[PDB]
Design a protein around this ligand. Sequence first.
Ligand SMILES: Cc1cn([C@H]2C[C@H](O)[C@@H](COP(=O)(O)OP(=O)(O)OP(=O)(O)O)O2)c(=O)[nH]c1=O
Ligand SMILES: Cc1cn([C@H]2C[C@H](O)[C@@H](COP(=O)(O)OP(=O)(O)OP(=O)(O)O)O2)c(=O)[nH]c1=O
Ligand SMILES: Nc1nc2c(ncn2[C@@H]2O[C@H](COP(=O)(O)OP(=O)(O)O)[C@@H](O)[C@H]2O)c(=O)[nH]1
Ligand SMILES: [Mg+2]
Ligand SMILES: [Mg+2]
Lengths: 109, 738, 375, 341
Amino acid sequence: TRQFSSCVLIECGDSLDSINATSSAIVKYVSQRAGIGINAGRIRALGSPIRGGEAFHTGCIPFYKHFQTAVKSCSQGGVRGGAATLFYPMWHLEVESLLVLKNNRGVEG
Amino acid sequence: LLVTKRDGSTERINLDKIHRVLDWAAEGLHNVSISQVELRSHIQFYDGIKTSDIHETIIKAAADLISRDAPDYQYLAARLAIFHLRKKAYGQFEPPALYDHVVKMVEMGKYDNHLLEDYTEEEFKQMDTFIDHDRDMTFSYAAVKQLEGKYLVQNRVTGEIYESAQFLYILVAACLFSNYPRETRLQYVKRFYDAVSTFKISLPTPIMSGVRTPTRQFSSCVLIECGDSLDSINATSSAIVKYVSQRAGIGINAGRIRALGSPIRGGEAFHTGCIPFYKHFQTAVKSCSQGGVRGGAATLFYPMWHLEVESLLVLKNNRGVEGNRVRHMDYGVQINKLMYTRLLKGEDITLFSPSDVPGLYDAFFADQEEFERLYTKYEKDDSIRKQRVKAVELFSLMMQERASTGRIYIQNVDHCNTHSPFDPAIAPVRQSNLCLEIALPTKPLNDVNDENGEIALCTLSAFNLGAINNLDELEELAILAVRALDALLDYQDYPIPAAKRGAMGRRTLGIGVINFAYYLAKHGKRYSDGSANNLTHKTFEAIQYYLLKASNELAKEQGACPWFNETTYAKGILPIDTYKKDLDTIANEPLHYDWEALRESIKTHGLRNSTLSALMPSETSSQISNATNGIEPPRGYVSIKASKDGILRQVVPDYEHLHDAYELLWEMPGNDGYLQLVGIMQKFIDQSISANTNYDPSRFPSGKVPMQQLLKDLLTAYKFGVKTLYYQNTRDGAEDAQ
Amino acid sequence: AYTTFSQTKNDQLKEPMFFGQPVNVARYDQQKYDIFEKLIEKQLSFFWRPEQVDVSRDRIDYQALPEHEKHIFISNLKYQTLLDSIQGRSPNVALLPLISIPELETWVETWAFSETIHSRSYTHIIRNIVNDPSVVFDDIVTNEQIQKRAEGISSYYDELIEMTSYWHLLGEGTHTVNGKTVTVSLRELKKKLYLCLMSVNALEAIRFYVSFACSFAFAERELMEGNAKIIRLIARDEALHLTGTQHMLNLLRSGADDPEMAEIAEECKQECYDLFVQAAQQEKDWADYLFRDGSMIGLNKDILCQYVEYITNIRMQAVGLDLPFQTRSNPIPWINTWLVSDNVQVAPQEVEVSSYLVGQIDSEVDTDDLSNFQL
Amino acid sequence: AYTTFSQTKNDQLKEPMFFGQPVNVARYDQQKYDIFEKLIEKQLSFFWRPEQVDVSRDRIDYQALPEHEKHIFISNLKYQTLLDSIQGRSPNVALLPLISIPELETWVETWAFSETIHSRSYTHIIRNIVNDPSVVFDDIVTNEQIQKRAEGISSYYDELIEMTSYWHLLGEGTHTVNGKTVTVSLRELKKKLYLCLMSVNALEAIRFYVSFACSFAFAERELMEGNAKIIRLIARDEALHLTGTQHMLNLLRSGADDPEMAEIAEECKQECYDLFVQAAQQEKDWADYLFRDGSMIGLNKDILCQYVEYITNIRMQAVGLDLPFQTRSNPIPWINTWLVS
Ligand SMILES: Cc1cn([C@H]2C[C@H](O)[C@@H](COP(=O)(O)OP(=O)(O)OP(=O)(O)O)O2)c(=O)[nH]c1=O
Ligand SMILES: Cc1cn([C@H]2C[C@H](O)[C@@H](COP(=O)(O)OP(=O)(O)OP(=O)(O)O)O2)c(=O)[nH]c1=O
Ligand SMILES: Nc1nc2c(ncn2[C@@H]2O[C@H](COP(=O)(O)OP(=O)(O)O)[C@@H](O)[C@H]2O)c(=O)[nH]1
Ligand SMILES: [Mg+2]
Ligand SMILES: [Mg+2]
């Protein structure tokens, strides 16, 4: 076994390509019984147009829960459950909503 | 009551010009009351109200007055809303010169610049001579509302409306026929624009909202498969993301992943069920799409002999902790004749891990005798890990969940294989798209952007059987439609190389029909008594033969498809050659057209598009035509369509002359006549058909619905050759008149 | 007195609706009245948890809509949450001791459970669109108008349980307690029961339908669609509760149990007319409390007052009373789209369909009749 | 007294579980008791109906059964039908005026609804296997054995209801009404409440489990598979109810909510223990009379008696009381692998 796995620091750009790559990397490492730390603070915030007004943006919460369902998949027959920590800056437009994503005072959605 | 312009400049009240607008809108109609509209609208007028609210409230107050006795308020409200659209878009009512509008929009970056690169000012002037702006009056209220809220080129984060429906149609036609020799492409554009703006052919939301703009993903439905490996699961997730980001509904064949308890990596770890992976695909499809032109939808398939099927049949349920439920992804169960006979004999059905039995999975689809042999052998073997479930129990559980949550779709594989245009050995069919509507071959991936995988992209269109008056316009419309769809097939932009490979190598299509209810009820027939078998046979023979003949002409003109040697139309076999024989006792109309000559022609030359026909639900796209949503009957002489763009009243077409000849969904004594109609359609149509079921407890003793009746309808839909079963629309007597 | 199982056997087909013997074992084969068993079955088949309509777009729609509309929505939801707490708690303790038939007592318990689910749903669609459920739920109890409506409803329940405790402890007639005489008259107890029933009918008839009218007038204008669908499920269950109470008290008044109850029905009928007038006035005042900052599109003081007047007219005429207003038409004719769920062809893959029926199928397979089916 | 809408605004996280200000608003975000929130969650998850199970082969097997087997089966069904009728009606009136937290209030409401569904399940099982459910239910009401059990159960219940009506009507101290002397007291009210809750615990943990063991030992012979499925679902729901009641008793007795309640439980330990033992002895005597025509199909009285001993001793040691028996190994192991999977 040439695999001595521990923490993994990953950064997630602001693009569907980079988010796909980030989710793929986090699932590929969690399959190796590691633990992830993501700099997902670059994902633009709700309300900012996509493709110059062509589409509406939904926010950071869908992608955050996407990384969550990716990290929580299949590390139950190992040593460590899917463990991850995200990071984001305080001046982010949606910090008043991303600061309350751990309490039970809100619905799963 | 002072009016307020769109920027703050208040002005004294002026309601007489608005009354003049109402008298223009209600001109030439019957049984209406602009006085009643005024009385209903002149209450919500506070001081300094804008015009962007006066118009909205007057349209709402003149639109909520549609009913079964004054059905011209639909045209009234449609004319009002199209006046408001012209106003909001171009300031005034007079539309602008097409060239000025298109150049301004390319400056804004809204349209595509290849239009200006290809066409010239004189071509745009003579195309402006084509446009029929006063055709807009022919829209219905639901038509205008769906058009404005979803189709017209618009800003989302602001809410600004740029163009009109006439410009939409003319520019769809232009960008459809820009790669043709300049001698006749203008005539093609004129003819296609006439045929698409006369509601003689319907075209779906993806292309209808996409072929003007720099966004290029027009394939309506997408099909992905998923191998038994983390890399393939990551590729599937990446594909789901990259496609739902571009207005596409997904069909995921996930029934290949091993089951719970199966060992991993040569036996050191142990699997943990497929619920986490299903959650992962759900979060992928639901994440990056909600802001777009529509929501993200993905059906997920599995074969009913799956080991965890007892725990996967329910996931769409309503009673369970999130930890073991995924209730935003439609499901699909794949069943066949061996399972059916295990049911009828009342014997046990076994369940194996679909990755711990060699060859059994692909036997299930390819050859039924191979499936039988391998099933029996592995049942006999006494070293595999297997489970055993009684067949009546399992089928009753499946139908129970199907009725309880409406959305456990059923797919009979052996019909999709032994009656198709693809061969079962080199290109089998293992799944279907979101709406259980098409059927194409695919292959699992290994990376996101490799070449050893395929992702089946299929675009759609449909005819309007409520506009044609004979059976030759169908052939002309067929040649135009196949031209347009092949143009789009080569003009698209494929974000994945595997899907580009598949779509460019198979040139698959789908062309169905809408307004079937208005057609079949204008010809004085019904769905229940069984008096439309002959008409269905005739109409669908016409459709399929004209499609094949147009595709053969196109193949003669511009070569065949680059994978024809893998179809079942090269060996010279046709739908009338391979249909299900049990369709004989329920239909006696003979074949009309020169099918043997067409057969020898396609034998010698080949087909352009490997798959011509497919019947679609057509929920949204069939509202602009004021049509009926496909092969389904309406639900009321004023039906209410409910989408995120407002609930909409819609009068069934020509209600004032057919208010006694329709057969609403809640009047048929059952679904047997409709299942027979669908069987005949499926016989004459290449790939799958999306067929619903109906069940009204108020037509049964003790308010129940007998599971015997459920299973009988299922077994009849299988016996008469129907590939799939889509819905389970269940009534409930929630009556409150007011 | 009260007991949870009386040993005296009796044909439960001959016992009155209310005030009979404490009920024996519950059975559902020999049923006296059919309406209550039918409603039990319907509400066992209408089961729905609140977490089936993904409202994730409606958080955005709400936090985007303006301030006075935010106020309207959250106020209606707070008021309904309080009243459904009250009305999921009261029926049990008020009407449960006074039941003589098992179908009726279990209909009461199923109605209480349905109201529990309703309150859970309201709390759920408040806990979603805001970030301050604490302040919202505290303003619920503290707010003056909410409090006054809740008092106006709960006073009757309080008086009725008081008199029932009297009648179950002391007995019938005049009695002296703590050096003070009380007159426990079963006739006055029946009158108070009929008054409580008619107040509950008023409540679940006009008030909640005004609230639903507001919350659906929101979603007529392309906003709060998932919340509208949840409140559509709730309006279905509420119409069912309404018909239940209607038939109950109409059967009591018609004269199917006692002519003295019919005379009480006449007197308390005058009284209930003067009660419905007060209910309608309270709803009008609530309307002009909501719509003060300015109207929305298609909903203001005039329209909602018209709706209150018309719905009171209809509920009165249907409950066998007089007509206080003019029998005008419906001011918001688009509410039939949300109430009548027969010709609404919803387009799935976008918005969930509220037409399922949980488990209402027989499931008795005739495997031999199936075996006579060659594929 | 009692009211349905309190006018104040109290810190609902501070009020005691019982004998406090009656609730006014139903609130779900600030949960004082995760136990009584996860209970309502799991119970809403476990919803079901009778009209999902098949009973035709059940009816045919009942017709083709022996007479003594028909006797024992229908008598056990009578027993559990009476039990769940009592349980479907009592908790609302018996406890809802006494509760001061909305979590526990909604839990009790869903508990009552679950018992209503159970009763409907039993009547549906009956009217599909025989032709005279009328006489079945009349022999239920008239049969003196199950009558004897109903005496104790409904006696605890109506004693509690009487004392709570007194305390909500008059107040406290020593009072005179109609020329009598009645002395209401919060301490005796809490004592009666604790005794009633111990009774509900013993019921939900013992009687129904003997009934389920009988029905499942029956279904083991490959007869009455519809009854097997229905009783499995009901054993699931009843294990849920049992856990809820046990956590209620522990949160009362552990002195975390009321030290008065802690002292009262320390006083009434003897009554609780003796109630448990008397209930268990009633179960084994019911079994003795059950095995009147000999024994059932592949069992005796010793196995079922040791099963009752096992279940009552385990539930007692779990709720926090002494052990009244000399425990041995599990006599009927398969039973514990048939009720909760
Ligand atoms: C195109 C698209 C983007 N997004 C979001 C997800 C990503 O975090 C973010 C960036 O996507 P990008 O991959 O950067 O898309 P883009 O470059 O075409 O957008 P732009 O023209 O504005 O630069 O946009 C969606 O959610 N749905 C979509 O359909
Ligand atoms: C590594 C790993 C895989 N899996 C599951 C997810 C995949 O769908 C499935 C296939 O994993 P694979 O990536 O195919 O693992 P493998 O190829 O090394 O193992 P083998 O040679 O036996 O095929 O196993 C887990 O559940 N947990 C894990 O830790
Ligand atoms: N993502 C997504 N896909 C859809 C939706 N509606 C339809 N589709 C896909 O489009 C195909 C045809 O749908 P159809 O009813 O004809 O849509 P329409 O032509 O735009 O009215 C189906 O196979 C679906 O896969 C939607 O709301 N969201
Ligand atoms: Mg970019
Ligand atoms: Mg592997």
